[PDB]
Amino acid sequence: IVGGYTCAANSIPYQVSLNSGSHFCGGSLINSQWVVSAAHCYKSRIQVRLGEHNIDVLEGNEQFINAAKIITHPNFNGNTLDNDIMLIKLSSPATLNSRVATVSLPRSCAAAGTECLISGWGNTKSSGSSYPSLLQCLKAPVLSDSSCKSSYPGQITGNMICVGFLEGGKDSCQGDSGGPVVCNGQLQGIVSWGYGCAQKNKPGVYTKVCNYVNWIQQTIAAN
Amino acid sequence: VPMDCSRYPNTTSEEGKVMILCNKALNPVCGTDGVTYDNECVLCAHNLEQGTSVGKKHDGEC
Numbered sequence: 183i184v185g186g187y188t189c190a191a192n193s194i195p196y197q198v199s200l201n202s203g204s205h206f207c208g209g210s211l212i213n214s215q216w217v218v219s220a221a222h223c224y225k226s227r228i229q230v231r232l233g234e235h236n237i238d239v240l241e242g243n244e245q246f247i248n249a250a251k252i253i254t255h256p257n258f259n260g261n262t263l264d265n266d267i268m269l270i271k272l273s274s275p276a277t278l279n280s281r282v283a284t285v286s287l288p289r290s291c292a293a294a295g296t297e298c299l300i301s302g303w304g305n306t307k308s309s310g311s312s313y314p315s316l317l318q319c320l321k322a323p324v325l326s327d328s329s330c331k332s333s334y335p336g337q338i339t340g341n342m343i344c345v346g347f348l349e350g351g352k353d354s355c356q357g358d359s360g361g362p363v364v365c366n367g368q369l370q371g372i373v374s375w376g377y378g379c380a381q382k383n384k385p386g387v388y389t390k391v392c393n394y395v396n397w398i399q400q401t402i403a404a405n
Numbered sequence: 406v407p408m409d410c411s412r413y414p415n416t417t418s419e420e421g422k423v424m425i426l427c428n429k430a431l432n433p434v435c436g437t438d439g440v441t442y443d444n445e446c447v448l449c450a451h452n453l454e455q456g457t458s459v460g461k462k463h464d465g466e467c
């Protein structure tokens with residue numbers, strides 16, 4: 183996250199880290215045994231880490247749970263990142279507490295202008311590398327579709343939304359992918375892609391979660 | 406085995422600036438220049454933006 187702030191402890195209890203030796207993507211806990219992340223974050227084996235404050239230290243109050251099933255959207259396109267959503271079933275149910283909690287799926291799509299919270303352990307600099315140990319947060323609004331399409335001509339599908347600032351300076355970045363965009367208590371975006379990070383006229387692009395609630399429910403119901 | 410930067414979507418600007426659009430996953434790779442790049446797409450974008458021709462020495466971090 184570039185241009186954000188250090189989240190307060192337990193502020194973002196639904197945030198998870200996806201680990202395959204080291205942190206590589208974020209994700210969001212939606213119920214005791216299911217995590218939502220980005221399809222491009224797919225790996226054959228994944229350890230889900232929950233309740234983490236500092237990803238470099240083991241404080242005893244986190245939970246590490248292996249993925250048992252990893253299901254990428256059937257129409258995911260690895261080249262354009264359309265349908266960039268994936269579900270992870272945990273090997274065992276997480277124990278929910280003050281540090282590990284869930285976020286609601288969206289009851290309706292977010293309108294342009296709605297204020298959201300983006301979080302993650304990704305790069306905090308636009309040029310260069312600097313990875314925080316502590317989870318970063320950023321408040322940013324959903325942009326209009328026309329505004330998003332004009333920033334990335336011919337690259338935005340109906341399953342994508344822009345969230346951020348056209349003036350640059352604040353955005354999600356490498357290491358944030360899969361992470362949440364929560365607006366009014368509902369998960370409306372998945373960190374997906376962009377032209378670099380925090381570049382002018384090039385806000386981040388996020389999977390439009392409100393399009394996928396029926397697929398999520400059907401998949402979960404049967405698995 | 407090197408790498409294919411075509412695997413990533415690109416867009417041309419008004420003045421001909423080619424921009425490579427990258428996913429935000431942290432999957433570090435080690436360049437032939439000995440520098441660790443955040444992911445392969447970012448190495449691709451660096452080469453395009455700087456005009457270099459760095460390759461991938463190996464999928465991990467240097």
Ligand SMILES: *[C@]1(O)O[C@H](CO)[C@@H](O[C@]2(O)O[C@H](CO)[C@@H](O)[C@H](O)[C@H]2NC(C)=O)[C@H](O)[C@H]1NC(C)=O
Nearest residue numbers: 261409410411412413414415416417423425449453
């Ligand atoms: C940029 O223009 O995007 C296109 C689309 O991926 C790249 O075009 C392709 O992939 O280039 C490869 C050879 O490198 C060729 O085999 C593919 O057919 C071709 N596809 C099309 C639609 O032309 C293009 O290379 C890329 N530009 C850069 C500099 O990365």
